Amino acid sequence: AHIVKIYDTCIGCTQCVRACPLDVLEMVPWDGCKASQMASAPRTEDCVGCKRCETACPTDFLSVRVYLGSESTRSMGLSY
Amino acid sequence: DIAGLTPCSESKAYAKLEKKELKTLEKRLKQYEADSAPAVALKATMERTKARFANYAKAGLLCGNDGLPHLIADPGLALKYGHAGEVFIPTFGFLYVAGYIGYVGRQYLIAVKGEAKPTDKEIIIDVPLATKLAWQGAGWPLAAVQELQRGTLLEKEENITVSPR
Amino acid sequence: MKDFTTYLSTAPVIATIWFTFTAGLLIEINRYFPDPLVFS
Amino acid sequence: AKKVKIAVDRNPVETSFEKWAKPGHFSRTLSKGPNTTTWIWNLHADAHDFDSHTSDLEEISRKVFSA
Amino acid sequence: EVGPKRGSLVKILRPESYWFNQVGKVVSVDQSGVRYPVVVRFENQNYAGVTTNNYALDEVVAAK
Amino acid sequence: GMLETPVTSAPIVATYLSNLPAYRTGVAPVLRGVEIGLAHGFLLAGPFIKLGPLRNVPETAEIAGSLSAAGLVLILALCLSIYGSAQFQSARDPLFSADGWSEFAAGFLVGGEAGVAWAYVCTQ
Amino acid sequence: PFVPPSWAPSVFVPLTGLVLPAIAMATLFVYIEKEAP
Amino acid sequence: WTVPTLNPDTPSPIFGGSTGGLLRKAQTEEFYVITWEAKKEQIFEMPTGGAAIMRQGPNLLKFGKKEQCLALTTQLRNKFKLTPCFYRVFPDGKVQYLHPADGVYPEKVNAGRVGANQNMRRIGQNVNPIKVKFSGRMMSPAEI
Numbered sequence: 001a002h003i004v005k006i007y008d009t010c011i012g013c014t015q016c017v018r019a020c021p022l023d024v025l026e027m028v029p030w031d032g033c034k035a036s037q038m039a040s041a042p043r044t045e046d047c048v049g050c051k052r053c054e055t056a057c058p059t060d061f062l063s064v065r066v067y068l069g070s071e072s073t074r075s076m077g078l079s080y
Numbered sequence: 081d082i083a084g085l086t087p088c089s090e091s092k093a094y095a096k097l098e099k100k101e102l103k104t105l106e107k108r109l110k111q112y113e114a115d116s117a118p119a120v121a122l123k124a125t126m127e128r129t130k131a132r133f134a135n136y137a138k139a140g141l142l143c144g145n146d147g148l149p150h151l152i153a154d155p156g157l158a159l160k161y162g163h164a165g166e167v168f169i170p171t172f173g174f175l176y177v178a179g180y181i182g183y184v185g186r187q188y189l190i191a192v193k194g195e196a197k198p199t200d201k202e203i204i205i206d207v208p209l210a211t212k213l214a215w216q217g218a219g220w221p222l223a224a225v226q227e228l229q230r231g232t233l234l235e236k237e238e239n240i241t242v243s244p245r
Numbered sequence: 246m247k248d249f250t251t252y253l254s255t256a257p258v259i260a261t262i263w264f265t266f267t268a269g270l271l272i273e274i275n276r277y278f279p280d281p282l283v284f285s
Numbered sequence: 286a287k288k289v290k291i292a293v294d295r296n297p298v299e300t301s302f303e304k305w306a307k308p309g310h311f312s313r314t315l316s317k318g319p320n321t322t323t324w325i326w327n328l329h330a331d332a333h334d335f336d337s338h339t340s341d342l343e344e345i346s347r348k349v350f351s352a
Numbered sequence: 353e354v355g356p357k358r359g360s361l362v363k364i365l366r367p368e369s370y371w372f373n374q375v376g377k378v379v380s381v382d383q384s385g386v387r388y389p390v391v392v393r394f395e396n397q398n399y400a401g402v403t404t405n406n407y408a409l410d411e412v413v414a415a416k
Numbered sequence: 417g418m419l420e421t422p423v424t425s426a427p428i429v430a431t432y433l434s435n436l437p438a439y440r441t442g443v444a445p446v447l448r449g450v451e452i453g454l455a456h457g458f459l460l461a462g463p464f465i466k467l468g469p470l471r472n473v474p475e476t477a478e479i480a481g482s483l484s485a486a487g488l489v490l491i492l493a494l495c496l497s498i499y500g501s502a503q504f505q506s507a508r509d510p511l512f513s514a515d516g517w518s519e520f521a522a523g524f525l526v527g528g529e530a531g532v533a534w535a536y537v538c539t540q
Numbered sequence: 541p542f543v544p545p546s547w548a549p550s551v552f553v554p555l556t557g558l559v560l561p562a563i564a565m566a567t568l569f570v571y572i573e574k575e576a577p
Numbered sequence: 578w579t580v581p582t583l584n585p586d587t588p589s590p591i592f593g594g595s596t597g598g599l600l601r602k603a604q605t606e607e608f609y610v611i612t613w614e615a616k617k618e619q620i621f622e623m624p625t626g627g628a629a630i631m632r633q634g635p636n637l638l639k640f641g642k643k644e645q646c647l648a649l650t651t652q653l654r655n656k657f658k659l660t661p662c663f664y665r666v667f668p669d670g671k672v673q674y675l676h677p678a679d680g681v682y683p684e685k686v687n688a689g690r691v692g693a694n695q696n697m698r699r700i701g702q703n704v705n706p707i708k709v710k711f712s713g714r715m716m717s718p719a720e721i
């Protein structure tokens with residue numbers, strides 16, 4: 001399973017959640033930004049490591065980071 | 081002479097080389113007419129070949145056992161034995177032109193940084209400004225040194241972005 | 246005509262003229278001073 | 286039974302050097318001008334990709350015919 | 353009443369920022385006590401094409 | 417579902433496969449091993465004899481080729497055995513089990529070598 | 541005393557080139573495929 | 578909102594079939610089922626290749642991996658404006674429901690969700706790799 005971390009520079013644009021092609025991320029309430037919402041990664045066991053979320057994050061440096069880790073059938077994206 | 085070399089004017093191999101090149105040209109000549117277009121061109125080549133070998137010998141170059149000119153790069157050996165024109169003098173000839181080109185480009189780049197849209201002044205050149213800076217670059221060594229002494233040549237370390245370390 | 250002269254000021258057009266000029270100067274120098282090897 | 290006939294439009298475009306002085310005019314993305322050197326390569330890469338400049342088939346066909 | 357004035361120029365001090373040691377224009381400063389209220393705009397885009405970013409009060413200093 | 421096709425789904429093809437030793441259930445794995453081994457073993461001798469390095473020798477060609485076919489059957493028998501060890505470590509057919517495959521590999525060796533020997537007898 | 545027999549290559553070359561590799565590959569293939577208890 | 582229950586007898590779209598469908602994995606490890614309601618019969622594109630006609634009313638499809646189900650979900654939602662949901666089905670007969678986990682699509686913030694894998698710091702405030710060395714396994718400074 002890969003590791004996905006959300007850092008406190010998130011502005012709650014939701015672009016990472018929309019970009020993710022496996023519904024790994026979601027938005028949750030927060031008080032640390034104007035949007036009052038923060039990205040969350042509750043389902044990292046389904047993450048494949050495409051890093052589409054990082055491509056979509058506007059903040060600099062990124063507020064969502066993916067660290068490729070142990071491989072499995074789900075993370076290796078196999079249908080066989 | 082220097083490093084065992086000998087003047088090309090006194091080199092046996094150097095003289096033999098000239099005959100070989102002229103002999104090759106002469107062989108092709110005798111298959112044409114006296115004043116045909118090919119014959120005139122070949123004769124012109126032979127004249128340049130003879131002139132070239134006279135000029136290199138007259139220049140006082142050094143030839144090796146190969147009978148080909150060799151150049152001296154040490155400034156001390158060059159000025160000692162009058163070989164300054166091979167490498168030493170051309171060294172300062174190139175740097176003047178190289179600094180000229182670089183200094184002119186740097187002046188233009190600074191000039192447009194003040195404009196509203198510097199990027200559009202780089203793809204689309206401001207020719208009137210470029211020509212103005214092109215002529216003023218002849219004195220770049222003087223202008224370049226004065227910038228160095230006044231401390232405006234280099235940026236401050238605090239105004240340059242660097243990666244985490 | 247202002248726009249046309251602006252087109253001639255674009256980078257590819259300037260480079261073509263500049264290198265055409267620069268190359269021509271070098272070619273002409275070697276035409277009148279053939280085989281330069283030493284300043285002399 | 287649409288008849289086969291000659292069909293044209295008169296003076297569709299104006300002949301001017303204005304756009305010769307505005308690189309990238311054909312594309313919305315590149316029309317804003319360069320900020321990085323990547324813009325320069327994108328200009329030449331997409332110059333003849335008519336199908337991506339406009340979604341109008343008629344405009345695409347007319348460019349192909351004259352090209 | 354918190355942070356630099358709108359439209360003023362500030363120098364960025366975040367080492368992990370693309371614009372570290374570079375000058376940008378302040379667009380707005382949030383007064384809601386958020387973590388990174390200061391918004392700065394830059395004339396040169398970063399590797400992702402972005403030209404704006406949010407910074408904390410202590411990560412930005414006035415030009416010079 | 418899967419793309420239907422006469423090759424994948426035809427009556428004549430299905431019946432032919434169902435009669436092959438591999439798919440003929442109800443037969444002891446050892447017996448299926450012998451039946452499969454004999455067929456492959458008999459064929460395996462052909463190419464070695466005709467195209468081997470000693471093919472042009474009058475009488476040594478038959479012996480050398482068949483002896484090499486016997487060797488290849490021995491190597492194949494090892495491949496069958498270790499495959500069963502790796503695959504079956506912990507279903508309808510007895511063959512696909514640790515006990516069944518071990519018998520299957522043993523039968524293949526006995527049948528295969530018999531087929532190679534039987535092929536040699538045909539020549540001489 | 542040291543000199544090996546003149547037939548040593550005939551035995552050792554096939555042994556180390558065809559036999560031991562076969563056992564080594566079989567040993568390694570079984571080992572990697574083996575499942576933990 | 579309550580967790581929907583899958584109906585295995587739901588009709589499936591009109592599709593001839595292809596070679597890009599389920600493999601032996603579906604029979605041994607798991608597969609995925611996506612269901613949705615269709616306002617009218619329409620042609621859509623199968624993520625496995627080809628075109629299929631969705632019947633009016635409920636529709637059901639089976640796919641080999643999760644990404645295929647969520648790829649079809651994006652098509653149906655964005656273009657045809659439908660609202661699909663899919664499950665994970667195991668060979669033992671168990672059915673697991675997901676997307677939407679709580680009934681609301683993750684793009685929209687919803688109360689009751691608990692933040693996960695959230696670090697209350699920036700990327701630049703992680704410790705150096707030397708400080709997480711010999712921790713029993715390869716560990717990034719972001720993990721701690």
Ligand code: CLA
Nearest residue numbers: 082083152153154155156157158159160161162168169171
């Ligand atoms: C790139 C490095 C380099 C090297 C390896 C040499 C090597 C040499 N140089 Mg040259 N030289 C160089 C750069 C170099 N030079 C530069 C940049 C300049 C200034 C433009 C000179 C100016 C120069 C002069 C004026 C003379 C030499 C001479 C020499 C020779 C002996 C002395 C010497 O320099 O010893 C090794 C070199 C170095 C340690 C580097 C510095 C050398 C200084 C600049 C010159 C030393 C001259 C020396 C005191 C002369 C004493 C008399 C000599 C007959 C023994 C030797 C072949 C002498 C010569 O012609 O000998 C036949 C000589 O008269 N050089």
Ligand code: CLA
Nearest residue numbers: 459460461462463464465466467468469470471484485488
């Ligand atoms: C594919 C390429 C190829 C081919 C066709 C051959 C062919 C041959 N090689 Mg050469 N060789 C090759 C590549 C090849 N070699 C390479 C790359 C090397 C370097 C490593 C060598 C090194 C080499 C050596 C050192 C020697 C040969 C020798 C031979 C001969 C005997 C081989 C043998 O015993 O096969 C045995 C064959 C089989 C066990 C079966 C072959 C495959 C069968 C026919 C498939 C049939 C399938 C069937 C049609 C399917 C039916 C399906 C249906 C029932 C549904 C033969 C002429 C030997 C010789 O003496 O040559 C004169 C020899 O000493 N080769």
Ligand code: CLA
Nearest residue numbers: 468469470479480481483484486487490553554556557558
């Ligand atoms: C060091 C490794 C090695 C060795 C010792 C050999 C040895 C041999 N190879 Mg080569 N080969 C090798 C590596 C090796 N190979 C590799 C790596 C490749 C792939 C690149 C090949 C590919 C290759 C081909 C394609 C061919 C050979 C063939 C041969 C034979 C050539 C001489 C001959 O006329 O035999 C004649 C052979 C005999 C008279 C019979 C010898 C004994 C047989 C093969 C086995 C007997 C087993 C026995 C009955 C029961 C098990 C006993 C055991 C448990 C002790 C010989 C058996 C040729 C051949 O004839 O192969 C069969 C041939 O066509 N080899």
Ligand code: SF4
Nearest residue numbers: 010011013014016057
């Ligand atoms: S991680 Fe990036 S893309 Fe996702 S909500 Fe935060 S700022 Fe937006």
Ligand code: SF4
Nearest residue numbers: 020047049050051053
């Ligand atoms: S790496 Fe890919 S699968 Fe993982 S969270 Fe990012 S976008 Fe989703």
